[PDB]
Design a protein around this ligand. Structure first.
Ligand SMILES: O=C(CO)[C@H](O)[C@H](O)COP(=O)(O)O
Ligand SMILES: O=C(CO)[C@H](O)[C@H](O)COP(=O)(O)O
Ligand SMILES: O=C(CO)[C@H](O)[C@H](O)COP(=O)(O)O
Ligand SMILES: [Ca+2]
Ligand SMILES: [Ca+2]
Ligand SMILES: [Ca+2]
Ligand SMILES: [Ca+2]
Ligand SMILES: [Cl-]
Ligand SMILES: [Cl-]
Ligand SMILES: [Cl-]
Lengths: 302, 302, 302
């Protein structure tokens, strides 16, 4: 009898039957209201038998699997605040609409009984973070919340190596799917060695064993963008470095720099960034559903 | 039947009756033994109906609400060690007097059943911390201990922005009371956006919901110094920067720099620092008692 | 009925009878298969009545006290991976041999019921860590796992001061045995004040009280190398600084720098490093067994 959880029938049953469920951040429905994107991700997850679970906050409730009605508002309403783990309390108390970030979502996902969550890119150590200390709450949320997060590594505007170092310090397992290098978002690789996992059944058995030993906490699973859709590393690096020089002469610091680089990157891809991002998103999502199916099967042995 | 807790009658009853209680660090009694300061803080807390609870360590016990007898020693004895969370074990084992810091106090406060603690300023990221790694244990204690800490932000000798960044990484909610900027101790504002809370009942409902979702952990509530008593930001900044240059040419590093800046700041205020500090302390304390009363009321609904 | 633990008879009984047990990392058997080193450490621990417990991973099991058969493989097999806390899940899932690091061992030690672990040196903040963010997972593992770790501080290739700062932020108690300065591995002292503990019975009562207040988490106990065997600080510092300059002109960054400094240090000691390391290892181990005996006795009072 949970007062805060709002779970749809399909997801409730799936969990109640130890069937696989894959959590998704509300952002995906917010950005593209057209069936084009939302329907394709759902398609990619359902393929392996996993139930897609889009998570949001609405009317003082932690909604797991938004209704068609709620999907409408998240598309129409413009001023919906981004909610990480720390913003949840206020977001509920306010009773408005809350678009949950990576950190915020996995907390709710765990509470609902969901064990797998997916996104194109996670947060991490911002570039110049060693000085600025701008670090996503995601990384320390992974120490607390039991989950497997399936992504393509950290968002490209971040410092990939420093992020890997921070996660190593924080003791978060990082597995590379059929790869031994860390996935660098739209770029395929970063010069960072990760523990290879060629089989998802094996990988699901590594996480299960991890939770039995280290207790609750996130297993991070990286799946790099298909090489046919990958963006050249040198293109991304020189574009960011140049955009940083503009902020040096203009004199921009803090979380004003962050959205600058995001949109400066969109130009330098030749307008190919959205298609590369969407391509990764889909390949990643497909993997998550497959893993979640594997994980449910491993857990169904005991 | 707790062997380590020493709780006075008034506080025991108040907790046993779900009545509001506000924790205070022993430092306040230590510094000014005169009724002048101690009586005024107690007055400010009791106003809203909250029971003041001064916490210390004495004779291998975690004393919650010091007796008149103990208050005497904390005033007379000169060599009383400062005790943070990590020093507690030894402090008890030694059986001496222990003046608990912010980090140390909230641990004991939680253990006793207290949910609200107040101080003028909390610890944080020291200036040049990005290089020196000098960071108060307070910030990571807030991940563990369930409490609402009511302060005026970080002590002025610290790096306010970096502290805000560290707390964001650590997932500690920061609420500004009727303000949207972070309180910078004796200075009213720092250029750091905080989540606004205009009503303490609303704010108490945000914390309660936070604990139900993210489990135990501190909600940090900032209440800026009354503007009529606020110290000019530019006065504080130039005074510290100059004092830092003296340590550069003298060649001072580490926790030798910290007390230097503290006392160099006292001069540059025109001797107005103690009155500005005491003014903030009182306004902050009054808020804490009011919040604690609100929190008890929210919790009394279930 | 634990499926993952593999405990030898002697250790099982010792724990089942609240008798002292001291955990050891598998590395010691791996490096020197000759009875020379392994027999002497075992001798040093058993002296105080403590049961030595060497921990490893083999055939999907968390082996506590390796058999003569397993000791053979850890000596003969060359490609045995180093396993920290985060690597455990995969290591078990793989069913190979896993040589557990400091971080990995204490997790298993706790699970088995062991409360004391020893090593010559622990991990910490790497030199230039304030920029590189290269920090051992050990330091944040100490927030989670209940244990007393007996060492000679951080390995000499690390930044001792920054490590001390990081552990202070993380709220890990650091006690110096009959010393008030932090032990700097083969070098006796680092210019860092630590809380003095002259009596191990007192020290064991400080840890016990710490766990009762701050819950699970590591108490770190430093015991400096016997001065008669200590290496001059200036020798170590100038040797490392020079070795760093070689990596600057050669252009080496990351975890390629780490093993460089390790082996560059071995030369500059005049070949005395192994004997100084082994000397510390033994003095440290002897202390651990004595402490574990004291701790068991304190706990046997209730
Ligand atoms: O995907 C996200 C938002 O939906 C991440 O959680 C976000 O990028 C991290 O936040 P920040 O780096 O600004 O702290
Ligand atoms: O208010 C305090 C002491 O009473 C704080 O806890 C203290 O300022 C933090 O310690 P440090 O910054 O030296 O680690
Ligand atoms: O003693 C160890 C290995 O046996 C330590 O755990 C290791 O030195 C820490 O790892 P790193 O500093 O490379 O992260
Ligand atoms: Ca720097
Ligand atoms: Ca930030
Ligand atoms: Ca410090
Ligand atoms: Ca590292
Ligand atoms: Cl967005
Ligand atoms: Cl003081
Ligand atoms: Cl080694």
């Amino acid at each position: 009898p949970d007062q805060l959880l709002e779970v749809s029938d399909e997801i409730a049953t799936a969990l109640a039957e130890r069937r696989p469920v894959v959590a998704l951040e509300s952002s995906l429905i917010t950005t593209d209201p057209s069936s084009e994107t939302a329907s394709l991700i759902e398609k990619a997850v359902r393929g392996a038998g996993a139930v897609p679970a889009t998570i949001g906050i609405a009317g003082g409730k932690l909604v797991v699997g938004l209704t068609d009605s709620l999907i409408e508002r998240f598309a129409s309403t413009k001023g919906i605040p981004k909610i990480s783990a720390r913003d949840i309390g206020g977001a509920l108390a306010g009773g408005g609409l809350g678009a949950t970030t990576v950190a915020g979502t996995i907390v709710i996902a765990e509470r609902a009984g969901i064990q797998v969550f997916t996104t194109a890119g996670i947060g991490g150590v911002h570039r110049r973070g060693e000085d600025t200390l701008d670090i996503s709450p995601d990384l320390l949320q992974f120490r607390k919340t039991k989950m497997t997060v399936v992504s393509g590594g950290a968002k490209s505007i971040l410092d990939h190596r420093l992020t890997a170092e921070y996660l190593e310090t924080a003791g978060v397992p990082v597995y590379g799917y059929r790869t031994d290098k860390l996935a660098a978002f739209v770029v395929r690789e970063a010069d960072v060695p990760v523990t290879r996992m060629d089989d998802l059944h094996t990988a699901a058995r590594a996480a299960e064993a991890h939770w039995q030993v280290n207790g609750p906490g996130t297993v991070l699973l990286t799946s790099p963008i298909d090489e046919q859709d990958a963006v050249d590393e040198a293109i991304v690096e020189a574009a960011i470095a140049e955009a940083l020089a503009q902020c040096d002469q203009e004199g921009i610091v803090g979380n004003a720099v962050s959205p600058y680089l995001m949109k400066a990157l969109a130009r330098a891809s030749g307008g190919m960034l959205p298609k590369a991002g969407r391509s990764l998103l889909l390949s990643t999502a497909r993997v998550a559903g497959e893993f979640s199916a594997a994980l449910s099967a491993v857990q169904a042995e005991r």
